[PDB]
A paper describes a structure:
Arginase (Arginine amidinase; EC 3.5.3.1) is one of the enzymes involved in the final step of the urea cycle. In the reported arginase structures, their active sites contain a binuclear manganese cluster that is coordinated by one or two water molecules and two histidine and four aspartate residues from three conserved sequence motifs of GGDHS, DAHXD, and SXDXDXDP. Among them, the ZMO0432 gene product annotated as an arginase (zmARG) has the three sequence motifs found in arginase proteins. In this study, we have shown that zmARG catalyzed the arginine-hydrolyzing activity in a manganese ion-dependent manner and the dimeric state is formed by a novel helix-swapping manner.
Residue numbers in the entry:
A (entry chain A): 5 to 290
B (entry chain D): 4 to 289
The structure:
């Protein structure tokens, strides 16, 4: 067995500098690694704004980091991947690798308030594109790297609620299964039935931390200090708590072999503000 | 030459709250690189075994041992300045006592806190509420006996304090301790600047209790504990300042006096702790 942990502090897919610290802090908080560790080279945020590049903010650097993530994976030819992001787009190369290795026996359990199936026609921040790209849909600079696109029947989106009209149509068109926060709480029966009926032997788990209720976990986008009610376009916000997500992941991993785990979209507002405070205070560091 | 010392002091027993330990380690990781020497006070990690009240003080004996060891580490370096990454507020006892021995009545103590920390075991069993009084030579003899040069009360300024308890209002009045309210801080901190000028404060020790911060905007303090109710903390005063107010205040004061001490205390990073435990419990990484 050969696991690889990828520290992937990508922040450009969500155009939000604090993802970088969020990935480094996630890495610091994590248990000791079981196998190999690599960090994907990501330029630190400098305050210079990213620009839209043919409909995608930061297109060029995202393609570079996607290429470098794949190179680091190939270097270790791992059978399992833990990805410490970073915005949701960090899962593209890791889950593409797992699709090449495990093919139609892989299922993708996408734990997110949102389905991440938009394209640059709908949204300029690429962290909303990644699950669609794993199906081979969307912007070809990204889908060209996906050699074994996942069937929509081998996806389960858990924690999703109140989807946008585009997203509900996409989910409906492609027959993609979902599992609401309510059904996660009541035992995640759709996830168990899906693993059995779609013969999911290997499992890639993506945890977008914004599946979590921001009232109880305050290091996600929707817990940004000083926010107003409509600051995020009234898109869906998290309704699960950490024990719900842990239980769901362990339920699914008990009836299939977990080979992927991504933790994405950590936005540690307190740690960021504390880091900046210490930099600005007298004496310390000076 | 000037000899600085950074003291990492993950004491959690003074506030009887295990997450202070992680709070100190995280603060050390978030801080800029140290300029001089670094020591870490050995503190036993919380084991879940509850601390006991010992003659009116929770965890009395281990707090005395940690005080003695912190003093030893300071005297090993005989530093001219000290940065203390706590830890509950009691971590400032040995560092500020040393600074008082060195700088004597030329030192002012700027205590940035929602609370004055002048209680004794008669009022409160958690020793983090005792430390400023002990620096004045008041209170429990196991702690005051270590303070060779007690600070005179006119060389104290408590900034960010509001709505004190009756015992504390009487203590402050009887000893003529100067204060500065959150509102006065936001309007320019005129009481603090006046105090530096009028008392001719030449050297400055700054204690920052992070619970001076409004828990609505900084969520890593006691009063931002997820799921709290309104009266869980006895309706004691809660923080009203924001991080930019504290940074400005500290830099105002250090612009007209020589900063020789800085303590950052009472960090309780609820999100980091909850994420750390989540990762330990998840498949593949846990
Ligand atoms: Zn996502
Ligand atoms: Zn999301
Ligand atoms: Zn305090
Ligand atoms: Zn306090």
């Amino acid at each position: 067995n050969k696991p690889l942990r990828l520290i992937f502090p990508q922040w450009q897919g969500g155009d939000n500098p604090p993802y970088y610290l969020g990935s480094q802090l996630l890495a610091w908080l994590s248990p000791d690694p079981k196998g190999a560790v690599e960090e994907v080279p990501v330029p630190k945020p400098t305050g210079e704004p990213l620009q839209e590049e043919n409909g995608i903010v930061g297109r060029s650097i995202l393609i570079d980091q996607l290429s470098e993530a794949r190179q680091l994976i190939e270097k270790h030819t791992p059978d399992s991947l833990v990805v410490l992001g970073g915005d949701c787009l960090v899962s593209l190369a890791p889950f593409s690798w797992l699709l090449e290795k495990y093919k139609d026996k892989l299922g993708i359990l996408w734990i997110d308030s949102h389905p991440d199936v938009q394209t640059p026609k709908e949204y300029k921040n690429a962290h909303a594109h990644v699950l669609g790209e794993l199906m081979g849909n969307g912007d070809s600079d990204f889908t060209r790297t996906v050699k074994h696109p996942v069937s929509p029947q081998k996806i389960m989106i858990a924690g999703i609620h109140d989807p946008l009209p585009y997203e509900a149509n996409f989910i409906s068109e492609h027959k993609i299964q979902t599992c609401s926060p309510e059904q996660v709480r009541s035992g995640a029966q759709p996830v168990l039935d899906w693993i059995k009926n779609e013969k999911i032997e290997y499992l890639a788990i993506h945890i977008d931390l914004d599946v979590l209720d921001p009232h109880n976990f305050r290091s996600v986008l929707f817990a940004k200090p000083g926010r107003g009610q409509h600051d995020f376009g009234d898109v869906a916000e998290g309704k699960l708590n950490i024990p719900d997500v842990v239980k769901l992941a362990n339920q699914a991993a008990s009836i299939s072999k977990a080979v992927g785990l991504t933790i994405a979209e950590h936005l540690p507002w307190d740690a960021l503000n504390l880091k900046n405070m210490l930099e600005e205070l007298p004496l310390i560091g000076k």
